[PDB]
Design a protein around this ligand. Structure first.
Ligand SMILES: CNS(=O)(=O)c1cc(C(=O)N2CCc3nc(N)ncc3C2)co1
Length: 167
C-alpha cells in the first residue's frame, strides 16, 4: 500500500492521473519524482522549469554543480539528485527532444531508467515541449517500465485522450 490517490490503473504496474506533478509531489513526498530533463540539466521550462521553480532554484544550483563535475548526460540517460522539498530523490531522465531532431527510439532507453526504482511519480517522457506524441510515450512506458509508476498528466484534455485511446 502506498499514498498515491485518485489514479486510474492502466496495467499491473502503471497508473495515471490528471494532476500537476509539482502539486502531487508536494502532497505525496514520493521517494522518487522524475524530471523531464535535458542533457545540460538546464531546467528552463516544461516540467523541469516547474519542478525547479517549486524548489526556489535549488534544483538548478545542485544541477549546475553536477554538470561542472560530470559533464552532460546522454540522451536516454539519467542521474539521481536530491528531491529537495518535493521528494526524497529526483531522477533526472533525458528523453529525446523531437524539436532538436533526436531519435525517438531513445525513448525506450529513457524509460528503462525507471526500472532502477521500485516506485516513481513521473511525467510522460518526451511529451510536452519535447515534441513527441504522448500516446506513443504512454505505450513505450507501459511496454518498458516494470516497476510501479504513477504518471501525472497536467492537461485534462490530454489525460482524457490518453485514457480513452489506451489499448
Ligand atoms: C500555478 N502557476 S502556473 O503558471 O499557472 C503553472 C505552471 C505549471 C507548469 O508549467 N507545469 C509544467 C508542466 C507539467 N507537467 C506535468 N506532468 N505536471 C505538472 C506540470 C506543471 C503548472 O502551473
Amino acid at each position: 500500500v502506498n499514498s498515491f490517490s485518485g489514479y486510474l490503473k492502466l496495467t499491473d504496474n502503471v497508473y495515471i492521473k490528471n494532476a500537476d506533478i509539482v502539486e502531487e509531489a508536494k502532497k505525496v513526498k514520493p521517494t522518487v519524482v522524475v524530471n523531464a530533463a535535458n542533457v545540460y540539466l538546464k531546467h528552463g521550462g516544461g516540467v523541469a522549469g516547474a519542478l525547479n521553480k517549486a524548489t526556489n532554484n535549488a534544483m538548478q544550483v545542485e544541477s549546475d554543480d553536477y554538470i561542472a563535475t560530470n559533464g552532460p548526460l546522454k540522451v536516454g540517460g539519467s542521474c539521481v539528485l536530491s528531491g529537495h522539498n518535493l521528494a526524497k530523490h529526483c531522477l533526472h531522465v533525458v528523453g529525446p527532444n523531437v524539436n532538436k531532431g533526436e531519435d525517438i527510439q531513445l525513448l525506450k532507453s529513457a524509460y528503462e531508467n525507471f526500472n532502477q526504482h521500485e516506485v516513481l511519480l513521473a511525467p510522460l517522457l518526451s511529451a510536452g515541449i519535447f515534441g513527441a506524441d504522448p500516446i506513443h510515450s504512454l505505450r513505450v512506458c507501459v511496454d518498458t517500465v516494470r516497476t510501479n509508476v504513477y504518471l501525472a498528466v497536467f492537461d485534462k484534455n490530454l489525460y482524457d485522450k490518453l485514457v480513452s485511446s489506451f489499448l
